Amino acid sequence: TSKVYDPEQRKRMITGPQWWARCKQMNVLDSFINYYDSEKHAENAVIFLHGNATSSYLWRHVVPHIEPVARCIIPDLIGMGKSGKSGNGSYRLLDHYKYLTAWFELLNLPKKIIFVGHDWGAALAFHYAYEHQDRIKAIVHMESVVDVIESWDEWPDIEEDIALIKSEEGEKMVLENNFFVETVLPSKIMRKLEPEEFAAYLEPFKEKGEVRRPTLSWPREIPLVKGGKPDVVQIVRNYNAYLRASDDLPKLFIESDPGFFSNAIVEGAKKFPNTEFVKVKGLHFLQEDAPDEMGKYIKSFVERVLKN
Amino acid sequence: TSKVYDPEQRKRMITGPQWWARCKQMNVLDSFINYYDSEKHAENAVIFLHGNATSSYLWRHVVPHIEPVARCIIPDLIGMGKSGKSGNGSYRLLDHYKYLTAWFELLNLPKKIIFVGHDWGAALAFHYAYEHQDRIKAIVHMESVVDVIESWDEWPDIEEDIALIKSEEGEKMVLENNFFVETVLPSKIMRKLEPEEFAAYLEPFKEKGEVRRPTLSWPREIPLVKGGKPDVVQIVRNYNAYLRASDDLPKLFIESDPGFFSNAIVEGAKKFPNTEFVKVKGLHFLQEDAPDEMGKYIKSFVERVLKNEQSGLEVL
Amino acid sequence: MDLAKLGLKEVMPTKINLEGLVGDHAFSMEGVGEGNILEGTQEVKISVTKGAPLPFAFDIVSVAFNRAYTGYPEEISDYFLQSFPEGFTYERNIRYQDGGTAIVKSDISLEDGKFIVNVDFKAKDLRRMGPVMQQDIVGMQPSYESMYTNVTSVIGECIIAFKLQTGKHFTYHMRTVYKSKKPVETMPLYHFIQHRLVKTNVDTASGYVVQHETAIAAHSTIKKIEGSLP
Amino acid sequence: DLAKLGLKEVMPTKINLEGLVGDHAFSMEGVGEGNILEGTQEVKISVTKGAPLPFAFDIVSVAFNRAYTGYPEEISDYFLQSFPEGFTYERNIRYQDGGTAIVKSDISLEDGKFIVNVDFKAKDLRRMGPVMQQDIVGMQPSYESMYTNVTSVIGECIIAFKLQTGKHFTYHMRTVYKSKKPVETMPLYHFIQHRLVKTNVDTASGYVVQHETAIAAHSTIKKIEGSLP
Ligand SMILES: O=C(Cc1ccc(O)cc1)Nc1ncc(-c2ccc(O)cc2)nc1Cc1ccccc1
Ligand SMILES: O=C(Cc1ccc(O)cc1)Nc1ncc(-c2ccc(O)cc2)nc1Cc1ccccc1
């Protein structure tokens, strides 16, 4: 594509180095989770879950706004970011779930957490919350895996490309050509990333081989009723129905404008009770295009849930 | 352009020679008028006045309908048709009118004439109408010089062409290339004329030169309030005013559809009272794509007008 | 440069069988003629057979009178040819600049030697004073129809330009969805298809037009400043 | 011979623009130069207000002067002979979306260089559509048929945007090239070919450069001598 810099950006550009430096690691099963921690206000934790192609870096300019009211923890999911690779080299949805819940127990969380999810990130934080219902203070989602995919309608024209990666082409689409990081990632940001912000997202997957397999295998779990991995369909089916019942649990949805998936999913969002809705600048990686509004919208939401 | 023959027309085709053999002649001033005469039911006269590029032949299939209620008489205007040439060799509106009013006396008309005009021949019926208010029973018109022309708006894309013709290239356009007979005239007819029908129209102006002048100086009579000849604009203005008041006078407007000029003039025609409007499918030479329809329309109109031996004629 | 293996002997005519509806007038015309495969030249004898004669300029049903007759170079693939065997069609939308619209629904096929067509012209909302009902139209000038893949079918899009009698021009916007009903090997990338459709020579003649459509596929000859996109 | 008009072959066209897609006022620009029977012109299009802009960039790339076009002198050049004063177009663009844009520009002359001044206002662009979705690679080449109409030549052209999925998204463009000097020999009818292609390719940018070629021609088929038309 094309794209111009937001010029107001470089005054405050947090490069990859000056993100990772501010992270702490911890051992988890046969490997580890590099992750960020506000540390301070720890009587609440708000956990941030990036999705495919990205990393905990994707929440950098979002996370400060809400640091002053609760502890925020932003992992890299396994195989992504400076987090360490997976034991078996498999990276399906539950893999990510394995290494992530395991990591949870290591954090001395409150027993009432707030999850903030994006992309497949939201899927983790939904399928956790289904299985840990007593311990969700609130949920925040965006560009989310809300429910299963039957009708491609309000959806971006991304079929056939899905067939092209659930195909055996996808190996040489993604391992060989780093398709999601190099082609898809900047494509779906409004502004152009300063050449070092891109350098961040790229570095984890800077080289050919199965080291890219997370970016290939996340979308091969697309919950399509016809042709999608049955277990994933069953997982999203299950946390939807509960989500659909989650009357007691405060929610907040953030559609992006235009959006990418937001358009098609937003109907499904308000099939979940207790959702405060809001709207912000942009495409799919909305954190690149409206972090500060995203910021203070999540802040004022948490403030509400913390008033009873 | 393209155009295809009417399949069932050639069966009843009337060639030029077959028409002319049915025409009469009389001397008129310094020349003569070829013309066509129903003759019977002469208690009435319905005069049909063709216009530019045509001749009485224009009416050949229209007239058979009107003949059995009123005498029909259908001139060739001067220097056109098989009529005689004009004395001065000129052919403007009034030249056509002098020769035409002369021929109206040598014919034993009733007092109140019925007129059927088309194109300029309706301007001839409109002029005579203004100076003869007591000799007129009804006017049928079509594609007609209604009113003056203020702007080229709802008008066909023929500005430029007009000014191009009021210019020493109208000589070369008309005299040498027979512009209005060989192009403009089958151009403005839906069906394709049979070769011999076109041969009628072409027979006058077949030769290059001054035998083509009426087809050139007729559009050069066009009433543009800007740039048009002032005496012509004063004529039509005068009969337009008289025609707008002519409540007395029953009229019939046959709109052509698309038509050529019909679109730009339907509203002017509407400014004439006691007008019954009708509609037939054609271009400018409506007669050549629907004379049986015009035929019966004019018929029921004259039959209805001719009960002037009692009440009015447009209840209510 | 194969041929006999496709149902096609290079030598091949056409027989069109149109039926129509402009504004209000239900006509029914008909075509007979031929051209050839690889140089892609063609010409056919169109002839009204119901609703003669036409209230509208004839020249608007002439894009309705096949892209089998297209000259394809080696470097670009030929959807229409590769198509048959048996089932291939189009759906075509005209908007005349005066505001009138037109819809066209074929069905080509192969019998003996070659093609049959069932066309279905249908226009509406042309203006009285418009070049079509005023039969001003001398004919269409040439133009290049863009051609581009969309999945199971090809989209074509040209701006066709009627030469009016006054020397000026009347343009319309046409757009075509060619969909062959047997799935077929290769689908071309994106390219141009250039026509010049002319009418033969009919003087005053008998009542038939005959036109000579010939169209050859090509690629923008200003070749690309290699370091660029797309 | 191209003295006459007060214009040298190569020439620097500073190309200020003013834009509004939808909700968004943006005040771009473009600095360049090019040639005139080459047909070739390059511009460093900078975006200079409303960064970031919320829509695929290429919709405003045709907004960035047919002074630049190979007119073989067997087909007269409307635009060259509108100078020294210059000329104006009004462009009407209709995307297959249904979305539309009008392009209003004046191509004056002010210190020996082509001061153009483009204006561009679009809307009815659909959210899920390839302009809000920023899926446009770039413009394919195009063929803009030209014809005379009184003191004007209108251009009509079908542009195709190539998309990331290989599919295309096309639009239809009608342009009112009205001179302002009265110009003799108006042209017959012909097409101008373009390949417009972007070429500062993969940069740290801050700006996009495109290079448009522009040639007038006729055909490679030609008539049966019978003609008509
Ligand atoms: O697989 C997923 C996750 C997902 C999220 C929400 C949802 O409703 C369904 C699935 N997403 C996905 N699924 C498919 C595509 C995709 C497919 C083809 C293409 O050309 C562009 C994007 N993109 C993405 C997300 C993404 C990743 C990286 C960069 C941008 C966007
Ligand atoms: O001048 C006239 C007479 C006229 C009638 C009604 C009216 O409102 C105004 C004038 N007609 C005329 N005046 C001009 C033109 C004309 C000029 C150029 C052109 O391309 C097409 C028609 N046509 C015509 C009609 C015509 C006459 C002869 C042969 C064919 C058609």
UniProtKB/TrEMBL annotation, chain D:
Pfam families: GFP
One GO BP: generation of precursor metabolites and energy
Keywords of this entry: Chromophore, Luminescence, Photoprotein
Similarity field: Belongs to the GFP family.
Protein name as annotated: Green fluorescent protein
Biological source species: Renilla reniformis (Sea pansy)
